[PDB]
């Protein structure tokens, strides 16, 4: 409850920490890091230029609300829901943020 | 220095706080903090549904670097600068992040 908090915390944490580890291969990007603790709300973020096209949003966001991990926002190839499993997170505690929750109850995760 | 920091903290968390309070007239979207004090990164953030049209995106997002409120993205109608010089911040610690250095030479701020 607050085991599994911290637990999903960390988790959470950590798979965001590594995906900060690339970035695009195009331009004068910064890959960023905005993690709120208070709120449970985790991003990271692109920042820059791709010669003067403004290069700005975000790479991946995850949440944590009443116990589960809510994806946000993926724009990358990576599956964060198999990643997260793979960190040893219950396929029923991961809701797909962006599926609508018609979608949800389709696509095999939790519908919130 | 620590103290122009702390002002700066303050008042970018008051301004971007204060536009928490209204959000969009059309659908399901919250608006919601992202707010990381260890990398300075300050955001509010659009995240919900128009019917199936997933609503996802930054509205506004302040940082503050080398004694400076850069802002890397503004989505609303409000002049953001004009609102923090407003709060006693001076126009030289401004800078417009989603303007070339060069297009900030000539927008009216900082360069860096």
Do not use: C
Not at 76 to 95: C, N, S
């Amino acid at each position: 409850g607050m085991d599994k908090l911290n637990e999903y915390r960390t988790k959470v944490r950590q798979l965001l920490t590594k995906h900060l580890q690339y970035k695009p291969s195009y331009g004068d990007v910064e890959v960023e890091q905005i993690f709120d603790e208070e709120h449970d709300h985790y991003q990271i973020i692109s920042v820059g230029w791709n010669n003067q096209h403004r290069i700005y949003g975000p790479i991946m966001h995850l949440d944590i609300k009443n116990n589960k991990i809510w994806i946000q926002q993926n724009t990358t190839e990576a599956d964060i829901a198999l990643e997260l499993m793979e960190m040893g997170i219950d396929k029923q505690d991961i809701v797909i943020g962006f599926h609508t929750p018609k979608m949800r109850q389709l696509s095999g995760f939790a519908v919130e």
